[model samples]
Target chain A: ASIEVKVQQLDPVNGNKDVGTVTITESNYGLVFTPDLQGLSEGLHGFHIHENPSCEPKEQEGKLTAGLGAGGHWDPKGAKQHGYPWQDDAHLGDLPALTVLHDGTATNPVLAPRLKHLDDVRGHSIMIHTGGDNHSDHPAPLGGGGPRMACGVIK
Target chain B: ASIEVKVQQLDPVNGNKDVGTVTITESNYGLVFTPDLQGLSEGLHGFHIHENPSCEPKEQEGKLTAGLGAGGHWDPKGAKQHGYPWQDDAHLGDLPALTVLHDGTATNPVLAPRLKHLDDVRGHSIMIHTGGDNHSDHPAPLGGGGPRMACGVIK
Candidate 1:
């Protein structure tokens, strides 16, 4: 099975354009993620499957933020801790970091060894954080990925 | 089976907000759609099941617009024309118009007799158009719905 997601910026300043596409396909090895993105910042960015399909912004505390409507990471099995994509004991949403080029584009293919098919992320979302992920909750919670920059609902 | 969707406004001046909910349950007659929406304009509005789960803005001929990323109606069987929900020949996405009260709320239940089960719309979206729908493509395309005002991903 394959699922195609259209990615967009959460902030209005970016014009909310359809910046990219992510195609998740079931491969012989595992779930293959083929990402074709543009208009992103250079360097590494945190990526994961969020618990909900919404990329809508919501009020958190006294601040208005984006992608809060998507809730936390996908943890249907309740493996709360953040870890690498290959770990079986980590949250189901844990994914490899997406690396962006200096020209604000990314065209890479990654694999999630623990995920077998599209059902693992259907009805959820793929979120891109402003900062990089450490693959652990050492310095801060959820790898201190900072705020949500962009999102794509997985269906 | 049953499904619950949290509907939210798209491209709002203050960003997206949780307006209300839509619950689709399987009944002996067909699939019952119960919508409890608030913060909408008073009068009849267009409603349909979109092909994608996203409410993200997408570029149509190089202009960014809200909910374009969700594509058109969920016509998996290729019934392109609009018709009554009870008609077996209608587009699968042809839902009844939602009536909002003067206080900006709608709490009515509509039925889709042609729908066999929840799987018919589980991976799609419930969308609300700015203008009303006539269930015909005479005056305008797709029931004369203006723009996508609100949407919710149907899980």
Candidate 2:
């Protein structure tokens, strides 16, 4: 069945950070990600499918470490020789940054990467960054992608 | 343009009931409704578009009432029928009965008559009932449709 998506952008949860959901529906081509963001602070943020799940407060705590599991963009093809998104060879997870408008409405296009199935994200975490991912690292590790703003497990 | 929907069951206002947005879209086929229901013990709930947007506290406080709007369904065709989606001679607002599942999901197909456009529903109101409607007031008040359960403006 075409999975119906539910989206929410709460003002704040656990005292801080915006949160959202991205349900998927598998089709013949691939899975479609339907993101429902919540707990947002009204601005643009970096969002992507990370390599791990479990929004545990330990490994990635204080919103800064959440990037641990979402290691790098889903780059199965590895077309990029360590290049970032918006570059010649970017990973599948290198999605265009997401924008949360003033009304908490996300007016960005939902990104889709060629995957085996929606299950490609089953065990991964959908991470939102406090800043932006230019897809290239000028400063440091992972295109200088900074702390995780908020996160949600794909159910 | 595609559409999204969300529903929240709220406390009763005045005489009107409570419901939520059924549809949210900039698409061609418009009009969305969300039925926010509560305190409904059991059984199927009849839902339809009332003629007014006033949920004033003066009428039927905390309980549903009949003919609050005192107008017919938006049936511009003047058809006076119910329970049939295929018939054109039905009240534009005469939707099918809503069966309240054990878990509280209405689980009923949202069947709106005549009108089809989100713009058309911007200022409208949706009403829910504890009983059923026969389309004709032959056996009871307003066709035996039970007390109003909830009502909410569509904006």
Candidate 3:
């Protein structure tokens, strides 16, 4: 038995908004997430399965501005080295890059960390940064991701 | 309120796989969604909000070789003519056109009927096509959206 969460985002700049659902399946030691995408910015962005459940604008705003609520990628295993999901030794939360079309939509698979239970995500919020994440906290913009662009809570 | 669903295509040749999760939220009248994206061809593609939550697989050798699980856009208002979402009398399931960058990513938004409830999305799926949608059924190929490339079900 795994967990499933729904997500959405609204942007005033593009007059664009989107909604969709996700399933975080338990895979022995980790969790797998499948996201059904919709309206989006067709480009690479930093995404993390945060650590909070209140998707309120206030909580989401704080997380986006500070990356506090949605804790670092679920790294329970404590593995090291960060590459692509297939190559990473860190937590299962280490995910692959996301791709979007000119139309702004993405659908890809991801793995979560083994440290936390899938149920832990039921009431948490996730963060999407404007930049990419290398999973490293070095050279200032560590993890390769920068600027919080959007936030959502898992329902 | 309103519902927005973002989508991404992981693979475009065979069955278009969906991956990535960003956000899904519930507003006063509907839900909103944002998707993480990756791995797509460079060009325009068709994106829409399907009416069912069942993200089933279509027959690979059947007449519908393209992924049809996403079904068709959910336009409950029945009103015709497509324009911006803020505009009145617009189709409830209307979404903006998306363009994929060379690196393959799209940050676009989709608006769904505010009159519908979030539970209404169960057993439905979203799909991505090869071309762009003009919203006109005339001479347009499936409203300008060609074969299906990827798909995913909403939880």
Per-residue C-alpha lDDT of model 1 across residues B4-74, encoded as one tens digit per residue: 89999997345778899999987544576778899998766788889998877887797778888788988
TM-score of chain A of 1: 0.94
Q: lDDT of each structure?
A: 0.78, 0.49, 0.52
Candidate 2 stretches with Cα past 4 Å from truth are A1-18, A26-31, A59-72, A77-88, A139-144, B1-155
Give chain B TM-scores in order. Answer: 0.93, 0.62, 0.64
DockQ for the candidates, in order:
0.01, 0.02, 0.07
Tens-digit lDDT track of model 2 for A1-155: 34433332212334434454556665432344555665564544666666555454434335434335445555666764333232336565654455554455443333243443665666666666766554565665455447666666665
lDDT comparing candidate 1 with the true structure: 0.78
Clash list (residue pairs), candidate 1: none
lDDT of 3 by residue, B14-116 (tens): 5445544324455432344444556766665565556655344456565444445555565567656543222245455544344456766644322232424
Tens digits of per-residue lDDT for model 1, A49-128:
89989988888787778889899988777887887665567788877677565567766455565677788788999999
Q: What TM-score does structure 1 among the candidates reach?
A: 0.49
Per-model clash counts, in order, read: 0, 28, 81
On TM-score, the candidate that comes out on top is 1
**Number of the top candidate by lDDT?**
1
Instruction: Please state the i-RMS of candidate 2.
Output: 17.3
Write down the DockQ of candidate 1: 0.01
